[PDB]
Amino acid sequence: MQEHYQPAAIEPAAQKKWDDARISNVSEDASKPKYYCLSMFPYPSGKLHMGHVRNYTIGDVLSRFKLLNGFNVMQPMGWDAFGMPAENAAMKNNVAPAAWTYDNIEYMKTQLKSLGFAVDWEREVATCKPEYYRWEQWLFTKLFEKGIVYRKNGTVNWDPVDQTVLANEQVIDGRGWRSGALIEKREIPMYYFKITDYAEELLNDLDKLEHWPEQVKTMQRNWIGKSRGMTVRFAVSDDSKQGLEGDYAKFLQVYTTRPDTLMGATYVAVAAEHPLATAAAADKPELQAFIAECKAGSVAEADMATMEKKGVPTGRYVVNPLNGDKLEVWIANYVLWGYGDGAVMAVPAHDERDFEFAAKYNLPKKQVIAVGDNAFDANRWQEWYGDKENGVLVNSGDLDGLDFQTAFDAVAAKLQSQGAGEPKTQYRLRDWGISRQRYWGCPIPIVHCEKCGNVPVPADQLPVVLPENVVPDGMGSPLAKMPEFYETSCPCCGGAAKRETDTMDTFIESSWYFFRYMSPKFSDGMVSAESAKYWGAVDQYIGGIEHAILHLLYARFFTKLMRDEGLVNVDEPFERLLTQGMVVCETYYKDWINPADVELTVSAVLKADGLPVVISGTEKMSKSKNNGVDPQELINAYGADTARLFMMFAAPPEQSLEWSDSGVEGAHRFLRRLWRTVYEYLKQGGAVKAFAGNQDGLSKELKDLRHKLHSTTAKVSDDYGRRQQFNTAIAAVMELLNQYDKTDTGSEQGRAVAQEVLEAAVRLLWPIVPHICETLWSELNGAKLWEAGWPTVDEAALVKSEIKLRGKITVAADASKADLEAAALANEGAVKFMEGKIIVVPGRLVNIV
């Protein structure tokens, strides 16, 4: 054994031992219980960043822990390789996006192998390869046949200068980004997943996920936005039919989730495109201007709640079918023409938005809900104005006194009798548009034929191959200009036809890749049933909260689609879910300087020029402030184990991790100490059989150390398995070593206990720093570490020794105050001096007066 810790020595050899042993290359082995630990696979955008290293070390700790508990553990990796990164690099460097990701793949793959993650590289996928995306094309056509995917016209943001479609985030103040020209909204045919059909199943199944963090389930429910409310029809007043045609001359229909407050509607509001809006806007020019100002506007959800609510009166009127009030119809910029009806009611007394609107315009407010003896101020919104649970109706005539749900059922009753109303479920969830006017993406398997329409490619012809020898210019979609690509035959009639040229939302790959890992070379379908039956569902998923909504929702949706196709039998893909916290680092600068390029003394200056540089604040490692710390700088300088140890110890996984030079140093020093402990131990005796069995007759000191050992093993087992707090687990192992350091392990029995401590410590840290632990282990013991398995808790080591003057009794050391006092009134010498308060002094006397 060398005296000095050399990570650059032992880390490649350990990996080679693990590789040669093929401990991570696993099959569908019924001779072992399966465990599927999955980390969110990366975009091959170039190199790894500290976020990758944190995410994948967390998954590897969990994987290795289950491995040492004998599970058949699959920890797969692969490349989410479609998207804009490559397309952008293709413009920047005149290289094909394929060639640019593959170069990133083989680099990041050796970068990951370098870190020693216990990963089944035989299960590696790359989503940008035909043998992968052919299967999402296949499912696309299957669902397109059933109408679960359909074609309809949707609006997009067209930049008439950059000449492509822009995302609703890449538009700034109504204009483009790299062009900044006035966006043209254009109606183009597009493909959708009918995810609304699965809304209720996606909502209700969340309850099955007892091991998901509730916030993620909460975020998923709010995005689906189920509501149980009422459709309500308002008779258009006789004087207000001027210009109204058809069923819009008859009634204004709105949706509401507070029909219990229908007696409080003081006006109504219609979208800019509403027939009543435009029928009023004929002879009134200022309404036509308002309608145009609304049309020329963003529709971003974030822009909507942070928007000055604006309305205009119309002079048209409708009648509330409950109390006969005459209510003016306003046009308002918060009403959207597409979400159910194009119009809402407004109850300012019990809806804050309606309250601020009515306070701006001096519109009336009618309190119809009261909450106990709560005073009500018409010029002061308070939280209880919107109480759906602790309210009963007031100023509502024959509806006074009912709670929400009783008044709900009564208003439904009253409205249905008149026919003017019916209950209705609604969801904010829209359908999932998957078409992208982009090159580097899965081609959409549809061929357009003038005779046969939009026909899907037969399963025999799949894949529709994306040509890789392309360098997109950003001035269009190169597929739509490649006749050698889009020109084809019709599969139904054999005549001239053109392929679809849009590609798919790259969320499509990440929506089913966890199943493909079960059989990534299977050629007869998405996933062989043999592997799907064995692996079932992902036992543990690890990723960032940036995917808690859309990616998880799409992954769950694809699971239930794939189930309903009979490809899998699970309903939900991820049982356990762990959200990694982000990694932050200080920034340095008008001109942001990578920290490794900086000499930071109290002060801080450049690394080259040596001139004073500005030490700015601390934030997520990014490119916007050039504070990403390349983990390759970390591995070269301290080894992989120091890197993994630093991030697992710096903070709990869910919490943000602050980069720290002294932190990495400490991690490396602790590994240096762990190395020296074993070396010093073997220098004065060499290996011996670890202590085991009855510990009676061990000295008090060695007994305590065995107590500290097996209590540590229980707490590290708990921190790995249930709490998933790896920082406290590492702390506990440091506490054991500290007590060991203070324990005279010189005797024969002392060396046996010392051997027990060390053999447990290296196995307890192996999930975090396996390179040094694998090395130290084989220097302590000749068996395979993975075959010796996770250390067991010796519960005997946890039982600590037991503790007129009438007599003396023996009680336990962890006894109760009633435990000692109970034996006092049953002692022989006690009853002899008692003849039919009890001052119990723990550790001395228990006198009974």
Q: In angstroms, what CA-CA distances link 562 with 209, 512, 571, 572?
A: 19, 9, 9, 11
Does 547 bind ligand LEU (CB under 6 A)? Our answer is yes
The three-class DSSP label of residue 667 is helix
Find the DSSP H helices in 306-375: 352-361
CA distance linking residue 135 with residue 130, whole number of Å:
9
Specify the residue, 23 or 58, whose C-beta has the smaller distance to ligand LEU.
58
Using the CB atoms, write b or e for 399-412: b if 16+ within 10 Å. beebebeebbebbb
Q: Does 464 bind Zn ion (CB under 5 A)?
A: no
Identity of the amino acid at 467: P
**Dist. CA 115–CA 58, nearest whole Å:** 12
Q: Which of 377, 374, 383 is nearest to 365 (CA)?
A: 377
Among 10, 40, 199, 269, binds ligand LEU (CB under 6 A): 40
**498 beta partners:** 448, 487
Complex with ligand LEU: residue 41 or 670, whichever CB lies closer:
41
Residue 239, SS3 per DSSP = helix
Which residue number, 228 or 451, has a Cβ lying nearer to Zn ion? 451
Q: Does 41 bind ligand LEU (CB under 6 A)?
A: yes
Considering CB under 6 A, how many residues would be counted as binding ligand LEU?
8
Among 185, 221, 228, 451, the residue binding Zn ion under the rule CB under 5 A is 451
Q: Which of 63, 220, 256, 510 is the binder for ligand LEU (CB under 6 A)?
A: 510
- What is residue 212's three-state secondary structure? coil
Burial classification of residue 333, based on how many CB atoms lie within 10 Å of its CB (0-12 exposed, 13-18 middle, 19 or more buried): buried
Contact status: 766 vs ligand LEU (CB under 6 A): no
- Residue 351 contact among ligand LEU, Zn ion, none, beta carbon within 5 to 8 Å by kind: none
- The DSSP call for residue 829 is H
Q: CB-wise, 80 or 539, nearer to ligand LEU?
A: 80
Is the Cβ of residue 505 or residue 641 nearer to ligand LEU in the bound state?
A: 505
- Of 40-48, 481-489, 557-565, 776-784: span binding ligand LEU (CB under 6 A): 40-48
Return the residue of 5, 35, 36, 43 that touches ligand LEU, per CB under 6 A: 43
519 binds, among Zn ion, ligand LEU, none (CB under 5 to 8 A by kind): none
CB of 551 to ligand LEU, least distance (A): 4
Nearer to ligand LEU, 78 or 259 (CB): 78
Q: What distances in angstroms separate CA 258 from CA 347, 374, 426, 843, one per listed residue?
A: 9, 20, 13, 67
Binding mask of the shown chain, residues 626 to 645, with x at each position contacting ligand LEU by CB under 6 A: --------------------
| Residues in 116-135 at the binding interface with ligand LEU, rule: CB under 6 A | none
Q: Which residues are known binding-site members?
A: 623
Q: Identify whether the C-beta of residue 662 lies closer than 8 Å to the C-beta of residue 79.
A: no
Beta strands in 414-509 (DSSP E): 421-427, 432-433, 435-436, 446-449, 453-456, 487-489, 496-499, 503-504
Cβ of residue 510: shortest distance to ligand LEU, in angstroms? 4
- Cβ-based neighbours of 147, under 8 Å, separated by 6 or more: 194
Shortest separation between residue 41's beta carbon and ligand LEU, angstroms: 6
Q: How far is the CB of 127 from ligand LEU (least distance, A)?
A: 9
Residue ranges of E strands in 333-486: 343-346, 369-370, 392-393, 421-427, 432-433, 435-436, 446-449, 453-456
510 binds, among ligand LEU, Zn ion, none (CB under 5 to 8 A by kind): ligand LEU
Of all residues in this chain, which one has the CB nearest to ligand LEU in the complex? 80
55 vs 437 by CB, closer to ligand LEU:
55
Which C-beta is closer to Zn ion: that of 1 or that of 493?
493
* CA–CA gap between residue 512 and residue 287 (Å, rounded): 49
- Residue 767: strand, helix, or coil: coil
Task: Decide: is 774 part of the binding site for ligand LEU (CB under 6 A).
Answer: no
Q: Which stretch binds ligand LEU (CB under 6 A): 34-42, 101-109, 135-143, 254-262?
A: 34-42
Stretch that binds ligand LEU, among 41-49, 93-101, 175-183, 667-675 (CB under 6 A): 41-49
Nearer to ligand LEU, 79 or 659 (CB): 79
Nearest to 35 by CA among 559, 540, 768: 540
Shortest CB 503 distance to ligand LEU, Å: 16
Is 108 exposed, middle or buried, given 0-12, 13-18 or 19+ CB atoms closer than 10 A?
buried
List the one residue out of 152, 156, 198, 160 whose CA is nearest residue 176: 160
Residue 423, both tokens: 């209950």
What is the smallest separation between the CB atom of 249 and ligand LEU, expressed in angstroms?
A: 50
* Nearest distance in Å: CB 42, ligand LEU: 5
Which entry of Zn ion, ligand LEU, none binds 492, CB below 5 to 8 A by partner kind? Zn ion
**Contacts (CB under 5 A) with Zn ion, residues 481-500:** 490, 492-493
In the bound complex, what is the minimum distance in angstroms from residue 97's beta carbon to ligand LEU?
16
109 binds ligand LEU (CB under 6 A): no
Give binding residues for ATP as ranges. Answer: 623
Measured between alpha carbons, how far apart are the two ends of the chain, in Å? 67
**Which of 513, 649, 647 minimizes the C-alpha distance to 584?**
647
Residue closer to ligand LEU (CB basis): 40 or 716: 40
Site string for ligand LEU, 74-103 (x = CB under 6 A): ------x-----------------------
Q: How far is the CB of 86 from ligand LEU (least distance, A)?
A: 13
Write the secondary structure of 562-593 as one string of H (helix), E (strand) and C (coil).
Answer: HHHCCCCCCCCCEEEEEEECCEEEEEECCCCC
Segment near ligand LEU (CB under 6 A), from 15-23, 38-46, 183-191, 294-302?
38-46
Minimum Å gap between C-beta 190 and Zn ion is 22
Helix axes 640-650, 631-638, angle to 10 degrees: 120
Phi and psi (nearest 5°) for 251?
A: -155, 145
Stretch that binds Zn ion, among 59-67, 108-116, 386-394, 449-457 (CB under 5 A): 449-457
Which pair of structure tokens corresponds to residue 790? 């996770």
Cβ proximity to ligand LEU: between 622 and 728 the closer is 622
Interaction partner, residue 412 (Zn ion, ligand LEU, none; CB < 5-8 Å by kind): none
Q: Is 449 in the site for Zn ion (CB under 5 A)?
A: yes
Q: Which amino acid is at 471?
A: V
Which residues lie near ligand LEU (CB under 6 A)? 40-43, 80, 510, 547, 551
